[PDB]
Amino acid sequence: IVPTRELENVFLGRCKDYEITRYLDILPRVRSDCSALWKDFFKAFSFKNPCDLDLGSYKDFFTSAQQQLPKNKVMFWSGVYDEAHDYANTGRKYITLEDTLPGYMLNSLVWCGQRANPGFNEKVCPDFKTCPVQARESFWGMASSSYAHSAEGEVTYMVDGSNPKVPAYRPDSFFGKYELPNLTNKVTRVKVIVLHRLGEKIIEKCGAGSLLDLEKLVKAKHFAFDCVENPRAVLFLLCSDNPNARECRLA
Amino acid sequence: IVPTRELENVFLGRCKDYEITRYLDILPRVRSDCSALWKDFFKAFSFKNPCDLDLGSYKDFFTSAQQQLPKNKVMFWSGVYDEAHDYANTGRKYITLEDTLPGYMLNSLVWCGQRANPGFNEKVCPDFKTCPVQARESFWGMASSSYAHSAEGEVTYMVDGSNPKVPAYRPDSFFGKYELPNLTNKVTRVKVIVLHRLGEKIIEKCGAGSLLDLEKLVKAKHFAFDCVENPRAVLFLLCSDNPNARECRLA
Ligand SMILES: OCc1cccnc1
Ligand SMILES: OCc1cccnc1
C-alpha cells in the first residue's frame, strides 16, 4: 500500500488548524504543542518493524494528546461509519473519536516504520494483513481505549442491524475489545441505536440475538441499558439519501 | 472584531492538509505550492490601511488558486449556510465554494492590513461596516466571481424562502452581484431550491415575486430554469434535526 506523503507536514498542519480553529466551543485545547506531539507520535512507531507494534506502542502519545470529553456526548459505532458521522454532525450532536485531536490528525492516513534509516518509509509499506492482530490494531485500538476511558455520563453505540454476515455486536470488534472494557464508573448508561438500511432485509432486533448478549454484558457491568431501532431522526437522515424508498413515505 | 491568531501558520497548515488529503476524487490540485499562494494572498492586503481594497485586490491569489469544477455539481447558496452545506455533503452530491481550495483555506478566518510593520494587524480589525462596500466584499466577492466563472452544465442555487426581511433573490447579494453575472455559455440550466423553514411562515414561492425576477434574468442568458420548494431530499434533512415538526408526519 502507498503511504501518505509528507506525513510530518500533514500532521503538523492538521494539528495547528485544529488548535486555532476546530471544535473551539466543543472540546478543550491540548497543552502540548504540535512539535511535542509529533516527537511523541514519531517515537512510537519509528525504527520498528510494523509487525512488532503492540497495544502499548502509542501509549505515551495518547497520554499527551488525550482531551477531557463532554458529559453524555460520546458516541461509538460499528459497521455504520458514514451514517454515525452524519448523525453526530461534527461534534454538534455527538462527539466521535474522529473529532478528537489524535483522531482528526491521523484520520484516513497511512504510515509505517522500518528498521533502516530514516526509520519510516514514505513510499511503500507492506500490506498490514500480514501482521499479527495486536500490531494491526496498535494505533486505533489504543486510540479507542484512551477515548473510551475518558467518557462520562450516557454513551451511545450505533450498530448495523441488516448485515446477515456480521452480527450487530461481536466480542472481537473494537467496541468489544477496546471500548466497552474501558468504560469507567463515571459512565451511567449505554444507549444502542440499531440501524436498519432502507430496502434491505431486517436482521437484528433489540432484545434478541447478539443484542441480547450485549444487554447482559452491559448490565453485568452495572450500566443502565436501552435500545431503539431506526429512531425518527436517524430514519429521516437515511431517507434523505433514498427519498423514494418505501419506508420513507410521508402522509 | 478579533483577528485569527497565527494567520500565516493556519493558512499554510490548511493548505498542506488540503493538497495531500482533501477532495482527492472530486477536485483537481492546483499547481502553485502553499508558500507561493501565501505570498499572493498576503500582498493583496498587507502594508495598506485596513479599508484600502477593491474587487481587484486579491486578483493574483484567485488566479493561482482556481480549480476546474465538476460538471453539473456546482451549488450556490444565499441565507442558508448550514442547510446547503449539509445537503451538498462535503462534495458528495454538490461542491460549494467552501470545498474549493481558497474557500477551505480562509473559511471563518478574520484578518486585515495596516501600514506600519508587520503590515497586518494582530490585535483588531474594523467592523467592516466602517469600510466601503467594494473593500468589505473584496475577498469573498472575488472568490465568488472566480468560482462562478468556472461552473459548467447545470448549476444549483439554494435560497431562503422564509425570511420576511430579505427576499429569496436580491441583485445586491453575492449571488446577484458576483455569481449570476459570471455564469458562462457553458452553463445550461439554473436549478433553484427554495427552502421553507419548518414551523415558519412561507414568504417566497416559485413562480412569484423575486423568484420570478430571477427566472427572467436566467432566461435572458439563454439558460433553462426550474424551481422547486422543499424537495424531498432537503425536507428529510430539515426533519432529521427537528423530527417532531408537522411537515414531517409519516403515513
Ligand atoms: O483511518 C482513519 C480511521 C480508522 C479507524 C478508526 N477511525 C478512523
Ligand atoms: O468566512 C468565511 C465565509 C464568508 C462569506 C462567504 N463564504 C465563507
Q: Classify B105 as helix, strand or coil.
A: helix
Look at residues B20, B47, B46 and name the one whose alpha carbon lies nearest to residue B33: B20
Q: Is the dihedral of CA B131, B132, B136, B139 positive or negative?
A: negative
Rounded to an integer, what distance in angstroms lies between the CA atom of residue B30 and that of residue B65?
6
Tell the residue nearest (CA) to atom 3 of ligand 1: A107
Helix (H) or strand (E) holding A41: helix A34-45
Q: Which amino acid is at B58?
A: Y
| CATH number for the segment(s) A1-67+100-151 | 1.20.82.10
C-alpha distance from residue A83 to each of A70, A73, A75, A198, B149 (Å): 22, 17, 12, 12, 34
What letter does residue A2 receive in the DSSP assignment?
Answer: P
Rounded to an integer, what distance in angstroms lies between the CA atom of residue B87 and that of residue B90?
8
Cell of A199: 430496502
Q: What is the dihedral of CA B34, B37, B41, B42, to 10 degrees?
A: 60
How many CA atoms are closer than 13 Å to the CA of B247, on its beta-carbon side? 21
* Chain B residues lying within 8 Å of A232, measured CB to CB: 239, 243, 248
Determination technique used:
X-ray
Cell of A62: 495518547
Rounded to an integer, what distance in angstroms lies between the CA atom of residue B33 and that of residue B13?
12
Which residues touch A42 (CB under 8 Å, ≥6 apart)? Answer: A8, A120
Q: Assess contact for A223 and A190: CB atoms under 8 A.
A: yes
Rounded to an integer, what distance in angstroms lies between the CA atom of residue B26 and that of residue B92?
8
Rounded to an integer, what distance in angstroms lies between the CA atom of residue A6 and that of residue B83?
35
Q: Classify B56 as helix, strand or coil.
A: coil
Rounded to an integer, what distance in angstroms lies between the CA atom of residue A81 and that of residue A87?
10
Q: Assess contact for B81 and B193: CB atoms under 8 A.
A: no
Do B239 and A236 make contact, defined as CB atoms within 8 angstroms?
Answer: yes
Q: How many CB atoms lie within 10 A of CB A58?
A: 24
Find the helix packing angle between A7-21 and A34-45, rounded to 10°.
140
Q: Classify A155 as helix, strand or coil.
A: strand
- Active-site annotation holds for B98: yes
Start-to-end CA span in chain B (Å) = 50
Phi/psi at A164 (5° precision): -70, -15
Q: Assess contact for A96 and A75: CB atoms under 8 A.
A: yes
Residue spans per domain, chain A: 1-67+100-151, 68-99+152-251
Q: Which residues numbered 70-89 in A keep a CB inside 8 Å of some CB on B? A: 86-87
What letter does residue B40 receive in the DSSP assignment?
Answer: H
Rounded to an integer, what distance in angstroms lies between the CA atom of residue A157 and that of residue B113?
48
Q: Classify B188 as helix, strand or coil.
A: strand
Q: Assess contact for A217 and A180: CB atoms under 8 A.
A: yes
Rounded to an integer, what distance in angstroms lies between the CA atom of residue B155 and that of residue B71?
8
Look at residues B153, B232, B246, B234 and name the one whose alpha carbon lies nearest to residue B198: B246
Q: How many CB atoms lie within 10 A of CB A140?
A: 17
Q: Give the bridge partners for B195, in sequence order.
A: B160
Rounded to an integer, what distance in angstroms lies between the CA atom of residue B143 and that of residue B102?
8
Instruction: Name the E strands within chain B.
Output: 75-78, 153-160, 187-195, 224-229
Rounded to an integer, what distance in angstroms lies between the CA atom of residue A114 and that of residue B197?
56
Radius of gyration of chain B (CA): 19
Look at residues B38, B4, B34, B40 and name the one whose alpha carbon lies nearest to residue B19: B34
Nearest CA in chain A to B234: A240
- Active-site annotation holds for B154: no
Rounded to an integer, what distance in angstroms lies between the CA atom of residue B121 and that of residue B111?
7
Look at residues A108, A106, A77, A87 and name the one whose alpha carbon lies nearest to residue A175: A77
Q: Is B20 left (phi over 0), alpha (psi -120 to 50) or beta?
A: alpha
Helix (H) or strand (E) holding B88: helix B81-88
C-alpha distance from residue A227 to each of A167, A181, A191, A207 (Å): 15, 19, 6, 8
Cβ–ligand 1 contact at A140 (below 6 Å): yes
Cell of A44: 512510537
Q: Would you mind telling me the total number of residues written for chain B in this entry?
A: 251
Rounded to an integer, what distance in angstroms lies between the CA atom of residue B232 and that of residue A234?
16
| Chain centroid offset of residue B102 CA | 11
Cell of A47: 525504527
Instruction: Kindly report the CATH class assigned to A68-99+152-251.
Output: alpha beta
Rounded to an integer, what distance in angstroms lies between the CA atom of residue A58 and that of residue A43?
9
Which ligand lies nearest the alpha carbon of A105? 1
- Active-site annotation holds for B179: yes
Upstream peptide bond of A118 is cis (omega within 30 degrees of 0) = yes
Helix (H) or strand (E) holding A224: strand A224-229
Q: Assess contact for B104 and B14: CB atoms under 8 A.
A: yes
Cβ–ligand 1 contact at A108 (below 6 Å): yes
Cell of B177: 452581484
Instruction: Name the E strands within A45-167.
Output: 75-78, 153-160
Question: What string of H, E and C letters represents the secondary structure of B135-178?
Answer: HHCHHHHHHHHHHHHCCCEEEEEEEECCCCCCCCCCCCCHHHHH
Q: Is the dihedral of CA A87, A93, A94, A98 positive or negative?
A: positive
- Ligand 2 atom nearest the C-alpha of B108 is 1
Residue carrying the nine cell digits 458528495: B92
Give A219 to chain B, closest Cα distance, Å. Answer: 30
Q: Is the dihedral of CA A132, A118, A11, B102 positive or negative?
A: negative
Cell of A185: 464508573
Most distant CA atoms of chain A, gap in Å: 66
Q: Spot the catalytic one: B83, B152, B179, B204.
A: B179
Nearest CA in chain B to A7: B20
